[model samples]
Target: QGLHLELETRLQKMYGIRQVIVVEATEPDDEESIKQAIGSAAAHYLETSLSAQDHIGISSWSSTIRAMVSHMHPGKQSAQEVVQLLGGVGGAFEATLLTQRLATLLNCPAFLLPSQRIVEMEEVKEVLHRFDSITLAIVGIGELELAERGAVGDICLRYFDAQGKPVVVSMGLGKLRSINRVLGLAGGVRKVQAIKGALLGGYLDVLITDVGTARGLG
Candidate 1:
């Protein structure tokens, strides 16, 4: 229950987010508890926004959110759209499944951005323009690595806002060294912290990482 309690506290304190009223068990019989937790979290979000038909932009690399969605009830009468900000081709995980499944359940549109994990110079211009329309950008963090290596990656959900530049939120998560080579070299825990800082300072709206990692800007 330590992990569960810790997760709940972090969500409330850091993001002002809360869980649904159900209790999620840690084991097999805990299905009831799990449903409760998921419902609580989703209900809280819905209450805050009060709009079922909203554009919820999610990062593609989170296993936790994937599980969370499995427990939520599909929205009724209203259309809720879940858009994927990062591209899924060549990645080990398939983000389209998450987006498509959620959209199907909610009867909303699932928008998959046509771009690669590593956006090269050729694609930067076009992708930069796509950021303007994004509303809520959900991101992920690598907790274990942040604790051990004090670092993270630079690309995925990490971005910068130069003077006169547009505001874009990179929504995704990673483990230490999970995709280090993509950041220009060998990956390590240290890279996680570096990338975490960049995301915080750069103004990423909501960053969801594993439990126990430190958070906030600088």
Candidate 2:
């Protein structure tokens, strides 16, 4: 409780995040179990905390999100819908499946983004406007090495540099700030700097991470 709270507090102070949940891996050195721990922790939080009025917006290709969705059980509270935050990435079918599965567990309709990762701005805007009522956003924290220079991390495929500058100009991308809650799920020591950069950009309202990663953040 002590270290977790301290880490949470530090993260909150550093990023102005509303809340933070630092989960410790039950099996310390096992990478598989580390993902499981954080995923299950997030699942439990959602099951206990989500309201029927919340509309979930989720990123398509976050493995952490994939883990979270896999661990999630159908909860008593049902949200309005689960909308896709990003277009298809490596596996379009998998992306659709994740969103569909999450919506199913939430007992809500799934609204898939029927396009590739980068498409026409007008087309993206139109689809976005159609699904504009998202209240809570669930996204994955991406490491900067996978992104271009000047960028330290990405949330929902929108890259943010070290100094908190976002490199994208899109409709729903900007609209993320309007969403009430943005939950960022990620961990791994290698991702510490990237996560910090995302926090520096003020992209997430809540964060879910593992102990080592949390300690590294400090």
Candidate 3:
């Protein structure tokens, strides 16, 4: 509780994040266990917080988000709809399933990006337009791209620097600011810097992470 409260206080004030939730990890600490811990916490949050009028957006490739969905049950309260923020860039099948599975648990309709079945970079704007209705967005924070220099983190495939400035071309993620809630979920020593960059960049309104990552960020 001490570490959790400390992180929540510091992250919210420093990063200008609305809230932060830190879950305890296993004593020995394994990657899967950490993911499960945060994922379960996220699931409980969504179950209690999501409402009938909320339009939630999700990043399909996030394994943490996937674990959250898996931990969720068909709750009494559900969001109005669920939309995929990113296409199936790599994990086509699993990405699609993640969106649908979340929709199912939330008892809402699922809308996948058009690029899920095809390659249409131009359609990125169109999909972004659809996201205008999203009230809540959940994304996975990505580690720095070593292949492409000067990137500290990424959200929905958009890279940013250590200062939290976008390093790549804007894919209309500016609309994300309009969404009431933008939640970022990631943890691990490898992801600390990336998550920090994301926090600095103001890419998330809320952060859900484990104790170790929270301590690292602090």
Candidate 4:
């Protein structure tokens, strides 16, 4: 009986993670610590086997990337270009700055798509396709409907089928399949999940998120 119990226990243990590290945030000073923790986590994944040819898509809703950018160490690599999937006047400059910062850290080129979130015009599409190598993208998640739509739609339009009698939509890197339904704040979490799912689907080479949060949960 004892031997059978031990075997079952061992089998159960094998089904789950062996260890987990937990960090806490108590005050404003802890923010930096948290950021470092997140950055360290991202670094571990990034250092694994990322290549310039890989399309490393970043979600616009992730504040984790914003924090990680500050902690990243400069490095030299091939001059592959990083691309932004969305275009919005708001935070447009900051987005460019963040892209430049990341590209600088990674020693690569950066490109931002020229179309807005809700592009009702055909002229915008023509300009966005000029960039050559958009191997990776970085984005974030938040509790805003318009923000989510604009970001998600731009990503979809970039990589999937965007032209048809009524704009034949296909899978984007993120939760673009359900973008129209993401009309409220609750869709923030769902959007994040979709982005992560897309990453797991091989749309991204490096997916960075904050510590204490699930790394690859979709």
lDDT of each: 0.41, 0.77, 0.79, 0.39
Screening candidate 2 with a backbone cut-off below 3 angstroms (N, C-alpha, C), the clashing residue pairs are: none
RMSD of each candidate relative to the true structure: 10.3, 3.8, 3.5, 10.9
**For model 2, what is the alpha-carbon lDDT of residue 112?**
74
1-218: candidate 2 lDDT, tens digit per residue: 23578778987887788888988888866667777887888898898889999988888788888888889776453998888777853477788789889988888788776535665656557547645788888888877663545777777777777755776222244677667888888888777888887777677788888888888887
Expressed as tens digits, the lDDT of each residue in 153-195 for candidate 4 is: 2233333221111112112434332221110111122344444
Instruction: Report the CA-based lDDT of candidate 1 relative to the real structure.
Output: 0.41
Residues 34-117 of candidate 3: C-alpha lDDT, one tens digit per residue? 888878888988877877899888888889998898887764548788888877544666887888888888788887654266
lDDT of 1 by residue, 1-218 (tens): 23455554554454332221122334423434433443345434444543464555555555444655665565453345666656644542466577566667667667654435564544544433444444444443333222233333333444333210112324333321222111111112233354344444433333322222322211
The regions of model 2 sitting more than 4 angstroms off are 1-3, 75-77, 114-127, 146-148, 168-173
In candidate 2 the C-alpha lDDT for residue 53 amounts to 95
Position 188, candidate 1: lDDT = 23
Between candidates 2 and 4, the TM-score winner: 2
Each prediction's number of clashing residue pairs: 18, 0, 0, 15
Model 4 CA deviation exceeding 4 Å by range = 1-36, 113-127, 130-137, 143-218
**Per-prediction TM-score to the true structure, in the order listed:** 0.48, 0.85, 0.86, 0.48
Candidate 3 or 4, higher TM-score? 3
In model 2, the worst 10-residue window by lDDT is 167-176
Clashing pairs in 3: none
